[PDB]
Design an enzyme around this catalytic site. Sequence first.
Site, PDB file in Angstrom:
ATOM      1  N   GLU A  17       0.849  -1.183   0.000  1.00 20.17           N
ATOM      2  CA  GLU A  17       0.000   0.000   0.000  1.00 20.17           C
ATOM      3  C   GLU A  17       0.885   1.234   0.000  1.00 20.17           C
ATOM      4  O   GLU A  17       2.089   1.160   0.243  1.00 20.17           O
ATOM      5  CB  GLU A  17      -0.967   0.018   1.192  1.00 20.17           C
ATOM      6  N   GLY A  21      -3.277   4.423  -2.513  1.00 18.44           N
ATOM      7  CA  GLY A  21      -3.846   3.177  -2.986  1.00 18.44           C
ATOM      8  C   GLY A  21      -3.360   1.966  -2.232  1.00 18.44           C
ATOM      9  O   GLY A  21      -2.324   1.995  -1.561  1.00 18.44           O
ATOM     10  N   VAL A  23      -2.436  -2.168  -2.905  1.00 19.90           N
ATOM     11  CA  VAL A  23      -1.970  -3.022  -4.000  1.00 19.90           C
ATOM     12  C   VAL A  23      -2.354  -4.469  -3.712  1.00 19.90           C
ATOM     13  O   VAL A  23      -2.096  -4.981  -2.617  1.00 19.90           O
ATOM     14  CB  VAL A  23      -0.447  -2.925  -4.200  1.00 19.90           C
ATOM     15  N   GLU A  81       0.809  -5.285 -15.237  1.00 20.52           N
ATOM     16  CA  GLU A  81       1.544  -6.539 -15.323  1.00 20.52           C
ATOM     17  C   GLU A  81       2.201  -6.826 -13.973  1.00 20.52           C
ATOM     18  O   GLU A  81       2.659  -5.916 -13.281  1.00 20.52           O
ATOM     19  CB  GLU A  81       2.614  -6.487 -16.414  1.00 20.52           C
ATOM     20  N   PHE A  82       2.235  -8.094 -13.599  1.00 21.10           N
ATOM     21  CA  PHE A  82       2.709  -8.494 -12.280  1.00 21.10           C
ATOM     22  C   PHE A  82       4.212  -8.747 -12.300  1.00 21.10           C
ATOM     23  O   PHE A  82       4.727  -9.371 -13.229  1.00 21.10           O
ATOM     24  CB  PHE A  82       1.983  -9.760 -11.822  1.00 21.10           C
ATOM     25  N   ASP A  86      10.313  -6.440  -5.354  1.00 15.26           N
ATOM     26  CA  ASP A  86      10.793  -5.071  -5.539  1.00 15.26           C
ATOM     27  C   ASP A  86      12.229  -4.963  -5.053  1.00 15.26           C
ATOM     28  O   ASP A  86      12.770  -5.871  -4.412  1.00 15.26           O
ATOM     29  CB  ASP A  86       9.885  -4.026  -4.859  1.00 15.26           C
ATOM     30  N   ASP A 127       8.348  10.225  -7.766  1.00 14.22           N
ATOM     31  CA  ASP A 127       8.221   9.458  -6.525  1.00 14.22           C
ATOM     32  C   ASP A 127       9.140   8.254  -6.515  1.00 14.22           C
ATOM     33  O   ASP A 127       8.796   7.203  -5.965  1.00 14.22           O
ATOM     34  CB  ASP A 127       6.782   8.982  -6.322  1.00 14.22           C
ATOM     35  N   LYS A 129      11.608   5.531  -5.536  1.00 13.34           N
ATOM     36  CA  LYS A 129      12.128   4.909  -4.327  1.00 13.34           C
ATOM     37  C   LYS A 129      12.402   3.448  -4.651  1.00 13.34           C
ATOM     38  O   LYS A 129      11.903   2.932  -5.659  1.00 13.34           O
ATOM     39  CB  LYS A 129      11.134   4.994  -3.155  1.00 13.34           C
ATOM     40  N   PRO A 130      13.176   2.750  -3.813  1.00 14.50           N
ATOM     41  CA  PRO A 130      13.388   1.312  -4.065  1.00 14.50           C
ATOM     42  C   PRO A 130      12.102   0.521  -4.162  1.00 14.50           C
ATOM     43  O   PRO A 130      12.021  -0.411  -4.970  1.00 14.50           O
ATOM     44  CB  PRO A 130      14.230   0.870  -2.859  1.00 14.50           C
TER      45      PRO A 130
HETATM   46  C1  LIG Z   1       7.803  -8.177   0.209  1.00 14.61           C
HETATM   47  C2  LIG Z   1       7.199  -7.556  -1.043  1.00 14.61           C
HETATM   48  S1  LIG Z   1       7.828  -8.218  -2.518  1.00 14.61           S
HETATM   49  O1  LIG Z   1       9.065  -7.557  -2.795  1.00 14.61           O
HETATM   50  O2  LIG Z   1       7.773  -9.624  -2.451  1.00 14.61           O
HETATM   51  N1  LIG Z   1       6.866  -7.804  -3.684  1.00 14.61           N
HETATM   52  C3  LIG Z   1       5.608  -8.541  -3.948  1.00 14.61           C
HETATM   53  C4  LIG Z   1       5.134  -8.373  -5.348  1.00 14.61           C
HETATM   54  C5  LIG Z   1       4.854  -6.909  -5.661  1.00 14.61           C
HETATM   55  N2  LIG Z   1       4.464  -6.644  -7.006  1.00 14.61           N
HETATM   56  C6  LIG Z   1       3.749  -5.543  -7.294  1.00 14.61           C
HETATM   57  O3  LIG Z   1       3.392  -4.767  -6.365  1.00 14.61           O
HETATM   58  C7  LIG Z   1       3.413  -5.178  -8.666  1.00 14.61           C
HETATM   59  N3  LIG Z   1       3.582  -6.052  -9.698  1.00 14.61           N
HETATM   60  N4  LIG Z   1       3.231  -5.360 -10.824  1.00 14.61           N
HETATM   61  C8  LIG Z   1       2.844  -4.046 -10.523  1.00 14.61           C
HETATM   62  C9  LIG Z   1       2.966  -3.923  -9.130  1.00 14.61           C
HETATM   63  N5  LIG Z   1       2.744  -2.839  -8.294  1.00 14.61           N
HETATM   64  C10 LIG Z   1       2.522  -1.521  -8.622  1.00 14.61           C
HETATM   65  O4  LIG Z   1       2.464  -1.162  -9.781  1.00 14.61           O
HETATM   66  C11 LIG Z   1       2.360  -0.547  -7.540  1.00 14.61           C
HETATM   67  C12 LIG Z   1       1.223   0.209  -7.396  1.00 14.61           C
HETATM   68  F1  LIG Z   1       0.268   0.063  -8.310  1.00 14.61           F
HETATM   69  C13 LIG Z   1       1.074   1.113  -6.324  1.00 14.61           C
HETATM   70  C14 LIG Z   1       2.102   1.251  -5.386  1.00 14.61           C
HETATM   71  C15 LIG Z   1       3.271   0.489  -5.456  1.00 14.61           C
HETATM   72  C16 LIG Z   1       4.394   0.634  -4.478  1.00 14.61           C
HETATM   73  C17 LIG Z   1       5.026   2.028  -4.652  1.00 14.61           C
HETATM   74  C18 LIG Z   1       6.094   2.379  -3.649  1.00 14.61           C
HETATM   75  N6  LIG Z   1       5.552   2.250  -2.301  1.00 14.61           N
HETATM   76  C19 LIG Z   1       5.266   3.335  -1.510  1.00 14.61           C
HETATM   77  O5  LIG Z   1       5.524   4.451  -1.954  1.00 14.61           O
HETATM   78  C20 LIG Z   1       4.701   3.203  -0.100  1.00 14.61           C
HETATM   79  C21 LIG Z   1       5.875   2.956   0.860  1.00 14.61           C
HETATM   80  O6  LIG Z   1       5.954   2.172   1.788  1.00 14.61           O
HETATM   81  O7  LIG Z   1       6.964   3.745   0.576  1.00 14.61           O
HETATM   82  C22 LIG Z   1       8.165   3.524   1.313  1.00 14.61           C
HETATM   83  C23 LIG Z   1       5.284   0.865  -2.011  1.00 14.61           C
HETATM   84  C24 LIG Z   1       4.107   0.416  -2.953  1.00 14.61           C
HETATM   85  C25 LIG Z   1       3.341  -0.362  -6.553  1.00 14.61           C
HETATM   86  F2  LIG Z   1       4.451  -1.086  -6.663  1.00 14.61           F
HETATM   87  C26 LIG Z   1       6.162  -6.171  -5.370  1.00 14.61           C
HETATM   88  C27 LIG Z   1       6.678  -6.381  -3.966  1.00 14.61           C
END
Ligand code: A1D6Z
Length: 298
Positions: A17, A21, A23, A81-82, A86, A127, A129-130
Amino acid sequence: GPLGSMENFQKVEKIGEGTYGVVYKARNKLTGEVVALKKIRLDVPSTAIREISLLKELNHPNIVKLLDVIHTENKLYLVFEFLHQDLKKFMDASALTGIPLPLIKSYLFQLLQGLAFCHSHRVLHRDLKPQNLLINTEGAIKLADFGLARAFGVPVRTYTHEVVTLWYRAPEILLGCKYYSTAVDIWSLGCIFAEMVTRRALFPGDSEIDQLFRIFRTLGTPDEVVWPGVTSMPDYKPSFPKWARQDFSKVVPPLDEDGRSLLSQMLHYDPNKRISAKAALAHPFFQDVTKPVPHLRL
Ligand SMILES: CCS(=O)(=O)N1CCC(NC(=O)c2n[nH]cc2NC(=O)c2c(F)ccc(C3CCN(C(=O)CC(=O)OC)CC3)c2F)CC1
């Protein structure tokens, strides 16, 4: 918003999250596809609809593909796409050994390719970030969750980590620049590069002023000599403490001089001297770039 448009998707788990949003990992019941969903709760703006529509057109191997945009009930769903991991989790898994330099170099090169692509279309990420960088088993890394010029959505009340977003913020943002540039993305990526190398965040501030002062203690308090016009910026204060710069050999050991040279250009104070993504791709650091594969445990 109307009803039933998401019935084709089965949510399988909540995976993250952020400010605006939640996720999920999900499966399409019709196609079998596995996808990520970003769920944005609404209270809509048409300018934001158009911004998202343009991002859906910005397809590059190093940008996570936005597959669909679905409005239903009080929610906006973005379908992506999945990818399985990260960069934050990968650095956490690699903390004892570190990421091999060839893979650090490949990831940095790829991210500069994605940014040079976006920036050539005058699109900012804003935005970086790792946790915004997603990796797969083939060695690719991709930009995710671009920030919009104007945000929208009901802030997620369960999200408590917004303090981490300070760590990667460019100094011109912190100093009150309203119309910042693609250079803010180069700054963020520079911070991420240093973090991959040292296995520690470069500037982990916890307030806007602590973030600025952490930058100043390392790179020197900026002045008109190194950043013309800085003393006129909206949040600049003549009363800032005057710290002398440190040496980059202290900041990212044991990175080589090619890498340090590039990092120093990505962390220039003045957004007009800060290296562009395109110029960075031509840097001698990348003369020997390859594409290793990570050892991912999924
Ligand atoms: C242990 C976990 S993992 O490494 O196993 N793995 C599990 C699988 C997961 N796959 C996906 O999420 C994914 N796949 N295709 C598209 C995806 N997601 C996104 O497009 C997406 C999104 F739509 C909204 C927000 C985020 C991130 C952005 C940066 N964030 C923040 O800013 C909040 C924060 O805490 O900041 C420090 C964290 C959330 C997205 F990535 C990655 C992490």
